[PDB]
Design a protein around this ligand. Structure first.
Ligand SMILES: NCCc1c[nH]c2ccc(O)cc12
Ligand SMILES: NCCc1c[nH]c2ccc(O)cc12
Ligand SMILES: NCCc1c[nH]c2ccc(O)cc12
Ligand SMILES: NCCc1c[nH]c2ccc(O)cc12
Ligand SMILES: NCCc1c[nH]c2ccc(O)cc12
Lengths: 212, 212, 210, 212, 212
């Protein structure tokens, strides 16, 4: 349809893509997790596999437009390949991430973006004691791989992981799940790097479907 | 041949591709499933693997042509990469979908499209009790990942899953399989999203071929 | 090299690619299978894994040239991606096909093409009884995914599957294997679709002292 | 922003890419390892799986700029695909490396580059005796695949592998881990080749988190 | 530096790529193997996994240059994607080959090319008896997939497989390894095809690393 095609052409076909954030022009990315399933634990390797949706939000001036000039369009869907996306990376993964959903973002006229890819990830986690009442706790940090806090900052809208889509008949049940902004330093570099620490306490489900 | 070459050049060379549906120009996608095989169950991870053909139909004004101007061509096969396709997604997969067939669509002169890829998918399903007379029931929802009901609506032509190509010597026999349109909300967003709920009841095959 | 470079340039840079067959201009694809190895059976999922070569042949007028104009070149090898290839698909696979060879076709001056990829495929097959004298029978159909018999017809040169390269120390011995043209229908469409039915009878190979 | 866009355009859009080092113009690559986890040992195949971050540094004249001409920009992040990178290779791997992080480098105005990809690698290692107090030692060499020491020299900044991020609840604990420059020869060619020898001594962890 | 950029531009930016050999202009490809490890045997499927480096050499007139015109450059490294490469294929593989090294070749001013990728391959091999003194023998043939002996003449410089980099603590020790040229015919075609037969006799390693 005509106005949207016009908008996309104007946004994407007449300027260099945004070169990412800088010290002079930093960016804050909002992160939120929807934990869908703990699929698998491996006690011989201390890896656990999660399926989650990773909600990402940020805003770029270069993605702004006046809806009046585009038939009142206030937002649109577009392939995530058409726009800059933050290098938010799980820091304790053991396998490359597996993408389970289309990668398509929603862009709004004020230059804000929402992007929520579904992912399966194997990560470092010792599941010893998962078949007990107390269960086990594991944690996983997410943050920019390459940008320090001087270029990319992070925040969560809530410290409570969204569990409203958690698979009720998973082999594992969630005792608690939080997502908390933290600061980290790595050996390579003097500067502070921001992460969101996903902390999940869980155990083998012993009630519900399959259990009598 | 010559006329088809002209038609494909005229449709695919001279205009921007359809930017997807919008609130002002929504799209209805028709879905239907042909369930070919339940291949595997995993009771240590509560994952089940299906092979199915997913029939998708939709119509675009931008894909219309006058057959009179193209040697009376009324339809053609074309690579799915050549056209917009809907982002219909299984919401409870645990691995990336595996495509088992070419991805080629049929486009008709009225702009309607038929596209039927074969896929293998692992999804969240507790198979406990599958080896019993009563079997087990699992459900899997399919819908747009990024578009609400305001942009993409779904429908089925029948609520019965097509079982006429179901593998007769599968480990698992199908007791029932339905596909039903429904409405869902996710935490990220306040708008209604539409899905098709695929509900399959099954058990270990204990009769037929290989059972004397 | 020079003559061949000119031929490939002239064939592939001057006109749109063949858009595939139509009712007005159908195409017949010849298929033949060489079974190399039954690698694995899985009795917990009823899947069997085969390694085979699939010989495909067809002919397109748009691939014709006069050898006199190209230093008497009568055929050439080229990447299969440079030409149209038919969408011949195993209908009962359970995993994406794994290609084990380069995908390069031979094109002949009369427009005929030969293309023989090596593939490993997992497919739907109940292996119960494979460890018995009678063994087991499994079948796999191959045909176009999207074209009916009005656009793509199939044929074989023989109904005898080529077993001359079958791995002799396989876990499984082949009793027989046939490849036969058939007509099939599927729910989506009312038109006849053509396939080649590959039927393999096999059993465990237990005897062998190297 | 504007100045960075100018800089990237100038560096990347007007000259052929650096064609790699030569005898006349050799390059020294500094290497360092951050060992994050020994994930798995396979005693039936003598393969061991590591997760590590591989820190690579080098300097090119062609990547220099005057910060004064570019709004006082002194460094920037850019996709590793935008620049030449060294073909540093694990010589005893048994599976293709799996990349676990974005591949983005930092380029500084003096032409220096820092690139630190996270990787999972299976390599040749006999883990017999890992379950004892003395543990086992394995070695893995890293070097250019195709350049001799006439074109690529290697250096470490320290002979101590960085263990500050080692996963505390790994199945395996590290007894020692060193990284040492060496000079090796291969049958194909007569020239001196340079490697970095990663030597890890480790055993099954039987103390700490998960142990009471 | 400057001279190499000139050379690569001159070689790669003006003429069509070599279209492969023909009967009128056949090509000799020299093959040699460096056997690094027998990683795994599978007695359930009769597959064995090897790691080897496959040394390939051939010469093209179109890759020649006068060193005098290019600052005395007599050879250079270049991505294998920049040049034509022969379709040398393992004939009894059971999985797609996995590449373990960069794919970069060395081109010399006389037009000759050296290219040595490291690979892991699963192939057809019955390992029954590998745990004995006499061990077991398996053979794997390599040759062009599509070119007969009239287009590609395969040669070896030696029938001795290079064992100088064989992993000393492999599960399997090598008793002998030879590489032998032979003529094959395939049912499809009347022409002779040339292959190299890699024949490896091996057994379970019962002495070496530890083996106290
Ligand atoms: N993410 C930890 C390593 C790291 C910090 N800053 C970086 C910049 C570039 C890079 O490739 C890697 C890094
Ligand atoms: N499908 C669930 C998440 C979701 C809803 N709307 C979306 C829009 C864009 C996106 O990447 C993701 C979403
Ligand atoms: N490599 C055995 C089959 C074979 C012989 N010649 C060929 C030519 C093309 C092709 O795809 C395959 C072949
Ligand atoms: N091959 C079975 C499904 C089928 C028949 N005709 C088709 C046309 C297009 C398509 O995507 C799929 C089909
Ligand atoms: N060091 C691995 C073998 C080797 C040495 N020099 C090389 C040059 C090119 C190549 O592909 C491979 C090599």
């Amino acid at each position: 349809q005509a106005n949207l095609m016009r908008l996309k052409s104007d946004l994407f076909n007449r300027s260099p893509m945004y070169p990412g954030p800088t010290k002079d022009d930093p960016l804050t990315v909002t992160l939120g997790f929807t934990l869908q399933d703990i699929v698998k634990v491996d006690s011989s390797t201390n890896e656990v596999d999660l399926v989650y949706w990773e909600q990402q939000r940020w805003k770029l001036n270069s993605l702004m437009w006046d809806p009046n000039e585009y038939g009142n369009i206030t937002d649109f869907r577009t392939s995530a390949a058409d726009i800059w996306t933050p290098d938010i990376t799980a820091y304790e993964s053991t396998r490359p991430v597996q993408v389970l959903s289309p990668q398509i973002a929603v862009v709004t006229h004020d230059g804000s973006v929402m992007f929520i890819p579904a992912q399966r990830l194997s990560f470092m986690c010792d599941p010893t004691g998962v078949d007990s009442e107390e269960g086990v706790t594991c944690a996983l940090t997410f943050g920019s791989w390459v940008y320090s806090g001087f270029e990319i900052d992070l925040k969560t809208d809530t410290d409570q992981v969204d569990l409203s889509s958690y698979y009720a008949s998973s082999k594992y049940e969630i005792l608690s799940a939080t997502q908390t902004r933290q600061v980290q330093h790595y050996s390579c570099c003097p500067e502070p790097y921001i992460d969101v620490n996903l902390v999940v306490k869980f155990r083998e489900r012993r009630a519900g479907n399959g259990f009598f």
